[PDB]
Design a protein around this ligand. Structure first.
Ligand SMILES: CCCCCCCCCCCCCCCCCC(=O)OC[C@H](COP(=O)([O-])OCC(O)COP(=O)([O-])OC[C@@H](COC(=O)CCCCCCCCCCCCCCCCC)OC(=O)CCCCCCCCCCCCCCCCC)OC(=O)CCCCCCCCCCCCCCCCC
Ligand SMILES: CCCCCCCCCCCCCCCCC[C@@H](O)O[C@H](CO[C@H](O)CCCCCCCCCCCCCCC)COP(=O)(O)OCC[N+](C)(C)C
Ligand SMILES: CCCCCCCC/C=C\CCCCCCCC(=O)OC[C@H](COP(=O)(O)OCCN)OC(=O)CCCCCCC/C=C\CCCCCCCC
Ligand SMILES: CCCCCCCC/C=C\CCCCCCCC(=O)O[C@H](COC(=O)CCCCCCC/C=C/CCCCCCCC)COP(=O)(O)OCCN
Ligand SMILES: *OP(=O)(O)OCC(C)(C)[C@@H](O)C(=O)NCCC(=O)NCCSC(=O)CCCCCCCCCCC
Lengths: 128, 124, 70, 55, 178, 103, 459, 84, 88
C-alpha cells in the first residue's frame, strides 16, 4: 500500500491509474475498434487529399469551420433567458461597475473634503 | 548575542531599550562630564563633502585619508597608515558606544535594586 | 581554429600539453595569490582590533556609585 | 584619480508646460564603474559565442 | 512514430511498457552505473517471479498495484534524452525545416544557381506525377468496403509501382537541415 | 510480434526511395554557380573610422553646441581638502586643528 | 483651406477620365501630392487658430487628423489594388470615387467652424462607408453589419441635432469661436442633464463606448481592407474630436455627469482586452484592441485636464497608424489563405521573414513600447488619471499587462511554431505589400522625434 | 575540413568485469542467485584513463603545490630585500 | 556540433559491439540477420533491455510502438539509419 493520488481539475488522472482500462469487456473492445476505424477513415481522406500532386490549395477542414462557427455565430440563436443566465449576466455586467463607482466616489469625496479643509499639502503640484 | 536572550527570555525592564537609550541624565554617574572634542570644522568638512553619515567625530582622519588617496593616485596602496588611523578612531568610537550601553545597563540594575530595597523597607 | 582531435570510442580522450600546463598554471596562480594575501593582509580575516569585555570594566569609569548615594 | 562626476543634458526632446524632457546622461560612480564591467563581460561572451554558435 | 497504432494495447505490451518505465526511473534515481546495475537486476528478478502465472484476473490485479507503486515513487524529475518530447532540445531545429514546394517559388536567377539539383527535382516531379495516378487506383481496390479499419498502408506489388502515399514521407526536410 | 511482411516490404521500398532522395540532395562541384560583376593595417583603419571620427564629431558637438546653452553639462564640484591651493585665486586653505596623534 | 479641398474634388474627374489601366497610378500619385500639400497645415501657433475664412479653420488638434486623413488614401488604394483585379472598370472607378468622397467629407468635417456644418459632414461620412461595406464586402453578414453601423450611429446623432438647434436658439450662434468666448456654466438641472446626454451620446457611440460597441466588430470584420483601414484609423477619431470640441459648453456638469461613462470605460478596457485573449479571428481581435484604446481616449477626454487632452490626441494618431498596419497585415495573410482564422496559417516567420519583421514592429507599437508615441499618449493619460484618483492606476496597470499578452499572442500564433503542412500556396511577399507596411511604419517612428506635432492645442 | 579519419573500434574481448565495482555487484547478486548480463557493457567506464579518481578536497587543492613553492620563494625574496 | 557523419557501417559495427557485450547471447552464433526469439532464444524482457542498451549507446530514444517490433540487429540498424538520415 502507498499513499493515494487524488486527481483534480488541473491535475487529471493518469491513464495507468484508470480502473476503466482494467474493466475489459467485448463491448469495450468493439467500441475501441470502431473508434480506430473512424480515425483511420479520416486519416485516409486527409492523406489522399494531402499527397495529391494536382492540388495547390489549403485543405478545408469541416471540423475547424464548425469550431469557429460554434464559438462565434451559433451562440445567440441557442441562448435562452434562464434564472442562471439572468443572474450571472446581472452580476458580471453590473456589479463591477457599481463596485468601482463606489470605490472611486468615496476616494474623490475624501480628497475633496481634505482640499476644502485645506489639509492636503499640494506643494509643487503644478501639472495635472 | 547573549543580551538578546537576556532581554527577550528574561526580564525586559532589567535591560536597556536601544531605541530609547539613554534614559538617565549624563551627570547621574559622576559630575566631571568632559565634553567630546571635534577637530574638523563645519566648513572644511562641507568642502570635503564626505557624507552626512561619515560626518562624525572621526572625520579628520577620513579627510587625511582622502587627501592621501587623491595625492598618490597610481599607487593605490601607498597610504595605508591613515586608513589604519581612521579605522582605529572608528574602533574607539564603537568602544565608547559599548561603554554607554554597559553604563545604562548597570544604572538600570542599580535603580531596580534601589526600588526593591525601598519596597522591602516599606513592607517592613 | 584549433587542431584535429579524433573521437576515441570508450577510451580517454586525447589531451594537448598546452591546456594541461595552462590549467595547472592558473590553479597555481590562484593558490599563490591566496597564500600571498593571507601572509600580507591577515587582519582582513581574523580582525585587527580586540573586542573589549563589557563585564570587565570597573564601575569607576562607568559612573556607578555604591548603591547608597543617589 | 579625482572623483569626476557629470550630468550631460544634450538634446531637448520636448516641454509640457513646466516640465522639460531632455536626453540626459548621468556619468556618476555607478555608470563609470558598471560600463567597463559590462563591456568586459560582453566581450568575453561574444568571443565564447563565436565558438559556441558556429553551426 | 513510424508504426501505425492498434485499437488497444494487450496485457503483454502494458507489462513491457511498465518494465521500461520503471527501469528508466530507477536509473534516474540511481545515478551511478554499478548501483543501477544491481537494482536493475533486482527489479528484473522482481518482475519475472510472476512471469509463469496463467490466470488473467490476478495477473491484471498485478500491474495495477505495480502502477500505483510506480506512481508513488516515480522520481518527479526523470532523465529525458535531449531530443525526446520532454528534452532540452526537443523542437530546437523545427524552425530550420522548410518544405520542398517552396523551391517552386524561387526566382529564375536563384534557380540558375544549382542547375543539376533542379534537373533532378524535375525528374522526381514527373515520377510522382505518374505514380500518383497508379497509387490512387491501387489503394481504391486494396481497401475493404466500408473504409479502412487501420491506418496502415500497403506496399507496391507490381514492378514499376511505388508505395501508395510515399511523397511526403520520402521528401522529409531533414533531421538537421541547417 | 515483429513486422508483418507487408510492413517490412513497404519499409524497404520507402527507405530505398528516401536514400535516393537524400543522395540527390548533394551538390555537384560546380553547383553554386556564382555570377560575378562589380562597378595592424585593418586595426589602424578600424581605430580611425570607428573611434577617431565619432570622438571628433561628439567633441565638436559638445564643445560648440551643447555648452552654448546654460546648465547643459553640469559638473560635480571638486573636493577641497585642508592645505590645498586654488588655481583661480591662489589662496591656501588653512590646515586642521593639529589633533593629538597617537597610534 | 481650399488649396486642399479643390484638388481632392479634382481627383474625381481625373479618376473618371483616366485610362482603364492607369486609374491606380494616377490616383496614388495625386493623393500623395495632396498629402504633401496638406503637410503645410502643421505650422501652428500658440495663439488662437488658423482662421482661414468664416467657414473653415485649422488647429493643432485638427492638423494631425487632416494629415492622417490625406495620408491614408494612397495606402488604401495600394491595399485595394490586389483584390479588385477582376472587377470592371466602371466599378473600380466607383470604388475610387467612394474613397475620394469619404476623404472630402472628412477633410471638411475636421476644419468646419460651425457645429451644424460639422454635424452635416459628420453624417455625410456615413454613406460612402455604408456603400463600401455592403457592396464590396465578401461574406453575407456584411448587409447586417452595414445595418448596425448605420442605426447605432443615427440613434446617437438624431438627438444631437435637436440639441444643436436648441443651443442656437438660446445663445444665438453655433460658431465655435463665439461659443468658446461666450461660454456660460451649465446649472444642475434635469433639462441640462438631458442636453448634456444629447450632446455627448452621439460622440460616445462612435468611439465606441463600452456597451455601445457591438457595431464595430461586425463592421470591421465584414468590411473590405480599405474600409477597415478608414474605419479604424479616422472614423473612430471623429467622436473624440467632437467630444473635445463640445465639452467647452458642458461645464461644470461634466464634473459629475462623467461618472457612468468613466466607469464604463475603466472597466470596459479590461473586458475588451480580455476578450482579445480568446479570439479565433484576427480582424475581430484587432477591432477589440481598437475598442480598448478608444476607451482610454474616452477616459482622457472625460478627465478634462491638459495632460489628458495631450495624451488623447497623441493616442488617437498613434492608434490610427497602428491599427491600419495591423489590418493590412491580417489582410495580406487572408489573400493567401482565404480563411481569416488565426490557427490555420502557422509558422509564417519561416516562409515570410520580412513580413514577420513587419508583424513584430506592429505588435511592438500596439504594445506601447517606449519611446513610441503610443506609449507617450498612454503615459500622459495614465498620469492625468492618477491625479484624478490614485486608485485608477490599478485598472490602468492591469490593462497594460493584458495588452502585451494578447499582442504577443497574436505574434506567436501566426509567426512561430511549425508551418501548416497542407498549405502550399504561400507565395513570396510582393513589393506592394512590403511598401505598404513600410509606409505605415516609418511615419510613426519619425513622429516620435517631434512629438509636439501630435500633442494638440494644449501643448 | 572535418573529421573523416575512419575510427576503428577497440576489441570487445578487452572489457572484463574484474577489478571494478561491477565485480562486487556481481558477487552481491550471486549471493541471491542472480547475475548481471550487461556488466561488460559498462566496464570501459572503469578501465583506462577513467580508472583513477580524485577526491573533493584533492580537486579543490589542484594547484596548491606549485603555488605554495612560488609563495615560499616570493616571501623569502621579500624578506631578503626588505632586510637591507 | 563537430559531430562526425556516422555511416551505415558504423551503425552496424556499434550495434554488433553492444550485442557482443550481452553475455546472454553467444558471440559466435549471432549475425546481422540472427533473430532474437527464435535464433538466439531470448525473451521479451531481454528484447526490452537490448532496445534500452541501443538507446543508451546512440543517445536517443526509440518509441515503444516502434521498439517492440525490432527483432533483428539488421532492423535496429535500419531504424537508426532512417531516424538519423544516413545516406551510405
Ligand atoms: C538602437 C540604436 C540603433 C542605431 C543604428 C540605426 C538604427 C536604425 C533603426 C531604424 C528604425 C527601425 C526600422 C524598422 C524597420 C526595419 C526594416 C527592415 O526590414 O530591416 C531589415 C534589415 C535587413 O535585414 P534582413 O536580412 O532583411 O532581415 C531578415 C529578417 O527580416 C530578420 O530581421 P531582424 O530579425 O534583423 O529584424 C530587425 C530587427 C530590428 O528591427 C526593428 O525592430 C525596427 C523597429 C525597432 C523599434 C520598434 C518601435 C519601438 C519604438 C521606437 C520609437 C523611437 C524611434 C526613434 C526614431 C526612429 C526614426 C525612424 O529586429 C530587432 O532587432 C528587434 C528590435 C527591438 C528594439 C528594442 C529597443 C527599441 C528602443 C531602443 C531605444 C531607442 C531610443 C533610445 C533613446 C535613449 C538613447 C538615445 O535589417 C535592419 O535594418 C535592422 C536594423 C537594426 C534594428 C534597429 C533598431 C534600433 C533603431 C530603432 C529606431 C531608430 C532609433 C534611432 C536612435 C538610435 C539611438
Ligand atoms: C447600455 C450600454 C451603455 C449606454 C451608455 C450609458 C450612459 C448613460 C447613463 C446616464 C447618466 C446618469 C443620468 C442622470 C444622472 C444625474 C444624477 C441623479 O440621477 O442622481 C440622483 C437623482 O435621484 C434619482 O436618480 C432620481 C431619478 C430616478 C429615475 C431615473 C432612472 C434610474 C435608472 C434608469 C437607467 C436606464 C438607462 C437606459 C435607458 C434605456 C441625485 O439626486 P437629486 O439631488 O435628487 O437629483 C440631482 C439632479 N437635479 C439637480 C437635476 C435635481
Ligand atoms: C554625423 C555626421 C555629420 C557630422 C556633422 C555634425 C557635427 C555636429 C554639429 C551639429 C549641430 C548641432 C545640432 O545638431 O543642432 C541642435 C540639435 C537640437 O536642436 P535644438 O532646437 O537646439 O533643440 C531641440 C529643441 N528644438 O541637435 C540635434 O538634433 C543632434 C543631437 C541629437 C541627439 C541624438 C538623438 C538620438 C536619439 C533619437 C531620439 C530618441 C527618442 C527621444 C528620447 C527622449 C528621452 C528623454
Ligand atoms: C446609442 C443610442 C443612444 C440614444 C440617444 C441617447 C441620448 C438621449 C438624450 C435625450 C433625448 C432628447 C434630448 C433633448 C435635446 C436637448 C434640448 C434640451 O435640453 O432642452 C430641454 C428639454 O429636455 C427634454 O425635454 C428632454 C426630455 C426627454 C424626452 C425624450 C426621452 C428620450 C429617452 C430618455 C432616456 C434615455 C437617455 C439616456 C440614454 C442612454 C443611452 C441608451 C429643456 O427644454 P425647455 O422646456 O425648453 O426648458 C426647460 C425650462 N422651461
Ligand atoms: O515473452 P514476453 O513476450 O517478453 O512476455 C513477458 C511476460 C511473459 C513476462 C509478460 O509479457 C506476460 O505476458 N506475463 C503474463 C502474466 C503477467 O505478466 N502478470 C502481471 C505481472 S506484474 C509484475 O511483473 C510485477 C511488477 C513489479 C514491479 C513494480 C514496478 C515499480 C517501480 C517503481 C519505480 C522505480
Amino acid at each position: 500500500s502507498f499513499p493515494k493520488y487524488k486527481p483534480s481539475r488541473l491535475a487529471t488522472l493518469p491513464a495507468t491509474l484508470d480502473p476503466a482500462e482494467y474493466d475489459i469487456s467485448p463491448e469495450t473492445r468493439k467500441a475501441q475498434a470502431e473508434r480506430l476505424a473512424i480515425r483511420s477513415r479520416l486519416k485516409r481522406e486527409y492523406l489522399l487529399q494531402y499527397n495529391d500532386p494536382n492540388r495547390l490549395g489549403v485543405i478545408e477542414d469541416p471540423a475547424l469551420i464548425r469550431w469557429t462557427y460554434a464559438r462565434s455565430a451559433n451562440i445567440y440563436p441557442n441562448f435562452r433567458p434562464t434564472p442562471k443566465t439572468s443572474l450571472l449576466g446581472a452580476l458580471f455586467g453590473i456589479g463591477p461597475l457599481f463596485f468601482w463607482y463606489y470605490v472611486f466616489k468615496t476616494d474623490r469625496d475624501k480628497k475633496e473634503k481634505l482640499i476644502q479643509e485645506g489639509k492636503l499639502d499640494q506643494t509643487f503640484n503644478i501639472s495635472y | 548575542g547573549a543580551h538578546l536572550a537576556r532581554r527577550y527570555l528574561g526580564d525586559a525592564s532589567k535591560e536597556p531599550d536601544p531605541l530609547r537609550m539613554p534614559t538617565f541624565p549624563p551627570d547621574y554617574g559622576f559630575p566631571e562630564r568632559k565634553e567630546r572634542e571635534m577637530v574638523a570644522t563645519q566648513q572644511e568638512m562641507n568642502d570635503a563633502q564626505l557624507m552626512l553619515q561619515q560626518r562624525d567625530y572621526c572625520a579628520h582622519y577620513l579627510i587625511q585619508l582622502l587627501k592621501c588617496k587623491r595625492d598618490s593616485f597610481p599607487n593605490f596602496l601607498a597610504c595605508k597608515h591613515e586608513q589604519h588611523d581612521w579605522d582605529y578612531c572608528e574602533h574607539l568610537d564603537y568602544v565608547k558606544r559599548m561603554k554607554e550601553f554597559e553604563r545604562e545597563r548597570r544604572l538600570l540594575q542599580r535603580k531596580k535594586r534601589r526600588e526593591q530595597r525601598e519596597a522591602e523597607m516599606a513592607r517592613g | 581554429g584549433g587542431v584535429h582531435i579524433e573521437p576515441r570510442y570508450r577510451q580517454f580522450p586525447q589531451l594537448t600539453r598546452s591546456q594541461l600546463i595552462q590549467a595547472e598554471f592558473f590553479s597555481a596562480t590562484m593558490w599563490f595569490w591566496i597564500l600571498w594575501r593571507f601572509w600580507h593582509d591577515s587582519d582582513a580575516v581574523l580582525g585587527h582590533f580586540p573586542y573589549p569585555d563589557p563585564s570587565q570594566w570597573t564601575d569607576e569609569e562607568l559612573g556607578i556609585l555604591p548603591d547608597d548615594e543617589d | 584619480h579625482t572623483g569626476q562626476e557629470m550630468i550631460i543634458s544634450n538634446w531637448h526632446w520636448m516641454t509640457l508646460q513646466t516640465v522639460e524632457l531632455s536626453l540626459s546622461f548621468k556619468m556618476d560612480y555607478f555608470s563609470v564603474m558598471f560600463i567597463p564591467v559590462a563591456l568586459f563581460v560582453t566581450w568575453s561572451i561574444m568571443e565564447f559565442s563565436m565558438w559556441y554558435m558556429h553551426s | 512514430a513510424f508504426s501505425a497504432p492498434a485499437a488497444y494495447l494487450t496485457h503483454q505490451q502494458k507489462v513491457l511498457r511498465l518494465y521500461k518505465r520503471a527501469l528508466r526511473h530507477l536509473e534516474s534515481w540511481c545515478v551511478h552505473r554499478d548501483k543501477y546495475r544491481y537494482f536493475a537486476c533486482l527489479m528484473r528478478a522482481r518482475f519475472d517471479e510472476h512471469k509463469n502465472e496463467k490466470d488473467m484476473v490476478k495477473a491484471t490485479q498485478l500491474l495495477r498495484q505495480a502502477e500505483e507503486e510506480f506512481w508513488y515513487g516515480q522520481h518527479p524529475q526523470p532523465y529525458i534524452f535531449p531530443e525526446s518530447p520532454g528534452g532540452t532540445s526537443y523542437e530546437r531545429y523545427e524552425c530550420y525545416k522548410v518544405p520542398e514546394w517552396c523551391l517552386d517559388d524561387w526566382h529564375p536567377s536563384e534557380k540558375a544557381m544549382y542547375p543539376d539539383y533542379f534537373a533532378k527535382r524535375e525528374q522526381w516531379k514527373r515520377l510522382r506525377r505518374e505514380s500518383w495516378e497508379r497509387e490512387v487506383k491501387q489503394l481504391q481496390e486494396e481497401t475493404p468496403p466500408g473504409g479502412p479499419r487501420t491506418e496502415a498502408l500497403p506496399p507496391a506489388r507490381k514492378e514499376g509501382d511505388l508505395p501508395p502515399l510515399w511523397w511526403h514521407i520520402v521528401t522529409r526536410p531533414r533531421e538537421r537541415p541547417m | 510480434s515483429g513486422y508483418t511482411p507487408d510492413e517490412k516490404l513497404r519499409l524497404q521500398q520507402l527507405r530505398e526511395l528516401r536514400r535516393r532522395w537524400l543522395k540527390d540532395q548533394e551538390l555537384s562541384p560546380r553547383e553554386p554557380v556564382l555570377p560575378p560583376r562589380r562597378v595592424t593595417y585593418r586595426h589602424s583603419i578600424f581605430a580611425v573610422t570607428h573611434v577617431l571620427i565619432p570622438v571628433w564629431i561628439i567633441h565638436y558637438y559638445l564643445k560648440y553646441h551643447v555648452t552654448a546653452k546654460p546648465y547643459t553639462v553640469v559638473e560635480r564640484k571638486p573636493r577641497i581638502f585642508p592645505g590645498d591651493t586654488i588655481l583661480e585665486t591662489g589662496e591656501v586653505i588653512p590646515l586642521m586643528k593639529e589633533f593629538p596623534d597617537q597610534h | 483651406m481650399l488649396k486642399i479641398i479643390i484638388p481632392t474634388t479634382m481627383l474625381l474627374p481625373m479618376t473618371w477620365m483616366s485610362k482603364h489601366n492607369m486609374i491606380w497610378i494616377n490616383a496614388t500619385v495625386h493623393s500623395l501630392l495632396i498629402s504633401l500639400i496638406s503637410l503645410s497645415l502643421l505650422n501652428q501657433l500658440g495663439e488662437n487658430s488658423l482662421n482661414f475664412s468664416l467657414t473653415f479653420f485649422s488647429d493643432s488638434l485638427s492638423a494631425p487628423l487632416l494629415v492622417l486623413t490625406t495620408w491614408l488614401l494612397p495606402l488604401m488604394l495600394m491595399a485595394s489594388q490586389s483584390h479588385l483585379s477582376k472587377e470592371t472598370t466602371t466599378r473600380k472607378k466607383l470604388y475610387i470615387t467612394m474613397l475620394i468622397l469619404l476623404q472630402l467629407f472628412l477633410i471638411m468635417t475636421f476644419t468646419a467652424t460651425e457645429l451644424i456644418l460639422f454635424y452635416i459632414l459628420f453624417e455625410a461620412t456615413l454613406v460612402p462607408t455604408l456603400i463600401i461595406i455592403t457592396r464590396w464586402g465578401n461574406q453575407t453578414e456584411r448587409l447586417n453589419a452595414g445595418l448596425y453601423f448605420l442605426f447605432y450611429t443615427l440613434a446617437g446623432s438624431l438627438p444631437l441635432l435637436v440639441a444643436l438647434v436648441y443651443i442656437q436658439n438660446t445663445t444665438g450662434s453655433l460658431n465655435f469661436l463665439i461659443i468658446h468666448y461666450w461660454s456660460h456654466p451649465l446649472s444642475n438641472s434635469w433639462s441640462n442633464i438631458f442636453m448634456w446626454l444629447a450632446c455627448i451620446m452621439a460622440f460616445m457611440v462612435k468611439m465606441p463606448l463600452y456597451g455601445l460597441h457591438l457595431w464595430l466588430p461586425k463592421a470591421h470584420v465584414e468590411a473590405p481592407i480599405a474600409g477597415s483601414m478608414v474605419l479604424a484609423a479616422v472614423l473612430l477619431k471623429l467622436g473624440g474630436y467632437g467630444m473635445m470640441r463640445i465639452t467647452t459648453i458642458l461645464n461644470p456638469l461634466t464634473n459629475y455627469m462623467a461618472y457612468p461613462f468613466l466607469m464604463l470605460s475603466m472597466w470596459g478596457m479590461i473586458m475588451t482586452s480580455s476578450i482579445c485573449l480568446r479570439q479565433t479571428d484576427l480582424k475581430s481581435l484587432i477591432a477589440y484592441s481598437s475598442v480598448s484604446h478608444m476607451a482610454l481616449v474616452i477616459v482622457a477626454i472625460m478627465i478634462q485636464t491638459p495632460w489628458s487632452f495631450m495624451g488623447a490626441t497623441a493616442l488617437m494618431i498613434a492608434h490610427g497608424l497602428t491599427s491600419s498596419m495591423l489590418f493590412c497585415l491580417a489582410n495580406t495573410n487572408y489573400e493567401r489563405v482565404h480563411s481569416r482564422t488565426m490557427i490555420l496559417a502557422r509558422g509564417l516567420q519561416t516562409l515570410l521573414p520580412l513580413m514577420a519583421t513587419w508583424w513584430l514592429v506592429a505588435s511592438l507599437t500596439n504594445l506601447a513600447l517606449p519611446p513610441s508615441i503610443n506609449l507617450i499618449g498612454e503615459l500622459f493619460i495614465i498620469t492625468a488619471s492618477f491625479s484624478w484618483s490614485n486608485i485608477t492606476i490599478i485598472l490602468m496597470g492591469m490593462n497594460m499587462m493584458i495588452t502585451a499578452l494578447y499582442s504577443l499572442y497574436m505574434l506567436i500564433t501566426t509567426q512561430r511554431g511549425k508551418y501548416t503542412h497542407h498549405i502550399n500556396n504561400i507565395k513570396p511577399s510582393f513589393t506592394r505589400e512590403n511598401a505598404l507596411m513600410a509606409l505605415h511604419i516609418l511615419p510613426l517612428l519619425l513622429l516620435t522625434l517631434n512629438p509636439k506635432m501630435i500633442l494638440g492645442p494644449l501643448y | 575540413e572535418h573529421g573523416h579519419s575512419k575510427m576503428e573500434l577497440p576489441d570487445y574481448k578487452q572489457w572484463k568485469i574484474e577489478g571494478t565495482p561491477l565485480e562486487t555487484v556481481q558477487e552481491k547478486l550471486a549471493a541471491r542467485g542472480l547475475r548481471d548480463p550487461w556488466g561488460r557493457n559498462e566496464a570501459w567506464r572503469y578501465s583506462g584513463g577513467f580508472a583513477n579518481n580524485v577526491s573533493f578536497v584533492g580537486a579543490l587543492l589542484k594547484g596548491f603545490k606549485w603555488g605554495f613553492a612560488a609563495f615560499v620563494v616570493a616571501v623569502g625574496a621579500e624578506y631578503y630585500l626588505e632586510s637591507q | 556540433s563537430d559531430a562526425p557523419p556516422l555511416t551505415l557501417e558504423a551503425i552496424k559495427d556499434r550495434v554488433l559491439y553492444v550485442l557482443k557485450l550481452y553475455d546472454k547471447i553467444d558471440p559466435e552464433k549471432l549475425s546481422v540477420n540472427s533473430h532474437f526469439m527464435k535464433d538466439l532464444g531470448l525473451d521479451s524482457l531481454d528484447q526490452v533491455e537490448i532496445i534500452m542498451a541501443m538507446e543508451d549507446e546512440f543517445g536517443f530514444e526509440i518509441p515503444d510502438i516502434d521498439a517492440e517490433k525490432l527483432m533483428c540487429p539488421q532492423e535496429i540498424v535500419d531504424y537508426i539509419a532512417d531516424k538519423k538520415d544516413v545516406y551510405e
